[PDB]
Design a protein around this nucleic acid. Sequence first.
DNA 1: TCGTGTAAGCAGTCCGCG
DNA 2: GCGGACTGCTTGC
Length: 901
Amino acid sequence: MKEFYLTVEQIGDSIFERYIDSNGRERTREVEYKPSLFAHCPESQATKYFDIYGKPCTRKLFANMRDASQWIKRMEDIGLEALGMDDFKLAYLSDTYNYEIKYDHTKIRVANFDIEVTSPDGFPEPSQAKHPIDAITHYDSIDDRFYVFDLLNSPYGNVEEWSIEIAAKLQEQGGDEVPSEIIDKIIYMPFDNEKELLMEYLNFWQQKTPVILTGWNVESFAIPYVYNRIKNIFGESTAKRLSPHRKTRVKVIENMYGSREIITLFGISVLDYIDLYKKFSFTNQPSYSLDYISEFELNVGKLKYDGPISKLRESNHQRYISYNIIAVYRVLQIDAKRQFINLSLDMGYYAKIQIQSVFSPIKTWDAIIFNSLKEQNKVIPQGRSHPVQPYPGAFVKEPIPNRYKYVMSFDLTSAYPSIIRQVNISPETIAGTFKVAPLHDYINAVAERPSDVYSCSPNGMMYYKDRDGVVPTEITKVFNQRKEHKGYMLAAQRNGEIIKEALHNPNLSVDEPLDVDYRFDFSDEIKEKIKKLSAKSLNEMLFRAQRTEVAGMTAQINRKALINGLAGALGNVWFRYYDLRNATAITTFGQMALQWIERKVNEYLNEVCGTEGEAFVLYGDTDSIYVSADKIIDKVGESKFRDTNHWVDFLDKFARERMEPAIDRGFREMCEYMNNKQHLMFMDREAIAGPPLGSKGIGGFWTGKKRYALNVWDMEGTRYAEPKLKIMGLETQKSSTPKAVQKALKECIRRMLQEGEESLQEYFKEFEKEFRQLNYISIASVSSANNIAKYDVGGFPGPKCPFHIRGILTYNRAIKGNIDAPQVVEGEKVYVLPLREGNPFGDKCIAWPSGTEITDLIKDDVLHWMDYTVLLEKTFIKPLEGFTSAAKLDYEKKASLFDMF
DNA sequence: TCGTGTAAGCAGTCCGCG
DNA sequence: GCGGACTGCTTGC
Ligand SMILES: [Ca+2]
Ligand SMILES: [Ca+2]
Ligand SMILES: [Ca+2]
Ligand SMILES: [Ca+2]
Ligand SMILES: [Ca+2]
């Protein structure tokens, strides 16, 4: 097999590399790597190295890495550019792995771990590590085993061994319900004292040294706690054994307000799953406790126990250990679904970076572009300092607030990357500038043609047409990967809809789910077999189809994010290729493209309808248009349609055979106008939306920019078994809106779009009547909580104190004197409830940590004093009034002359 | 919230508005 | 009460 790296580090003048050799074995080596950097040289000096602008360079070979770094400093002192890759480990990987890396994940040691620490005096701070580590569960991907280290004797209690037999039993048998599929994979090790536990853990770690290290909050809690606890008991040298090279660094992570410390373990790649989830999931959750996320992702019930976690070990050690094990398994289950580890490895090896660098698109693209340029003997420019400067972004059309009955939407495939490719936007393809006219002059095609030689953006920039820039070249490669995975995702989605239809008529039989590849549209033979299957088999197939769709989603959406991140990075001062000329070239072209195509679509539709000046495009944001299809339907007449699916077919055909060719013609003209390198503006139909045929549903509505709802029958070629709501911006989509309120608002919208005014009125009346019965957590608002200390004046709200911070201050007064009560953590999320006048808490609201029950000390009082009237008005009635007034509809029945009977 | 970009919505504070 | 200036938060692209 071809060799591949596992980890790489610079330690002084040495590269430390862990890698898989050609026989599939893990090895470690120290290499005295001699880096090269570059300086500009005279034209007369023969060379094969050139900078990205074609200026010749001399290569400078250094005796060591320190000499290279010192040379960079002196070049700054002199005032001359020091060219080349200044991150020497990236240069090392580029030299050592000069080929597309093919990796074998089965050879990569992926460790998932979690620790328990009993603490009687509050949260056990990792920087202090003053309490014993009393449990570690460490899953190893190569062994496929859960290694359990269990402390039986502690100053906080002596306990009996954990029982695997009780652990396996149902909760109803008094067991812990540790999943049967992992029972045989547990290796249980009890210990008489903490010193022996930790010494054995370190010996185990030496034998099975993680390459990828993950878990939940491991970077912020488990790793620093373990490091500091070992450091406190044994000293620094022993704690450094967590690093295969015995090197660690306390790393200070800084943000807008305050900073925190993590421990860098040289030769390990830490990918904290909470951070993977936050970057790659595209959710925004009210809470990030493992319980909360596991319930959301897997539909598993919360791990239930009695009393505080600080007393769980002494009261129920059995459950304490089982829950530690299950917690590790839950992360593995989430990854089996979301496949974020697989993604990180794919992207990391593609870029040739430390795997943990996948969190940084700037680092990722720096590596990709460096490797690409190096292939041609080209030399990357030195990074420079730039002041942060604002620049313009996208155009968003102001919609007329209204109901919109029939709607078809269209948007550009990978808009900004497509613009980069079309225009040929790259640091080294800049050809010059032209005299800019107002944007509307380009939009309306009255401005003079920018260039007869170069490819242009309406911000004034001109680009070479003879050759592709490195940015277009590399962005295309990742775009092509994205396209492949999106294909699999959409096929799985379409396959899912087939199964859902079949589920209307399940067969009374005993059978098996079909062995199929859900990434490809089901053949006719598979469809016929599906129509004969039982509900059990069909539901298992639906589950598998949906898991395939999720896998495709992860792969495609994060590749989309990477290429969009390149366009964004051009506007970040820390990017080697930062250039506001290029950043603005993209965004300004985008504004033109949207408004240009709005004009073209309006022109086309006025032509087919025989009208003048009519606005068919009702809305657009960045790269999208929403087209009113009422007149198209009305030209045929609703009476002529057999059912809903019939008019959906008709609009689908109209979009594909009439609209898209017209859009394409419009964009081809624009490409010629701007003299672009290649026509790549592909604006495909997204949604077909409308009310069910013969209903009183309104179909859709807009309240304003970035705020709308559509009843969708077909999305990017997926024809739904049941209509699906596309809701954007509205409160149903905001993590701040209470859970039960999101649900109620969604049903209100569903009724508006599908059933009509009278149906909406019936539901409103019932919700208003019953909502006080809802569980307090389900009706609590949510907010991130920053700057608690800033607004805290002697425990009371200072000037301009935000509402949610006021709530936290209220909470803090109510729990004062308790070391056991949960503390609100700066920067994390809180639930928030309004309080009625004259409550014992002395203020108008209270807040507590999200994803948790409020502490028993105050729960009963909070419940008694909760202001249901304010809650309802703020979270439900106000947004609903917004929806209904926009839609020209009433949520309460108005009086009429009929009432007199 | 360490980690690519901008546009833009709504909640709430403060305070003007005769 | 509603708006504007402002902070804070969050979402859509
Ligand atoms: Ca725990
Ligand atoms: Ca798009
Ligand atoms: Ca059937
Ligand atoms: Ca879009
Ligand atoms: Ca599309």
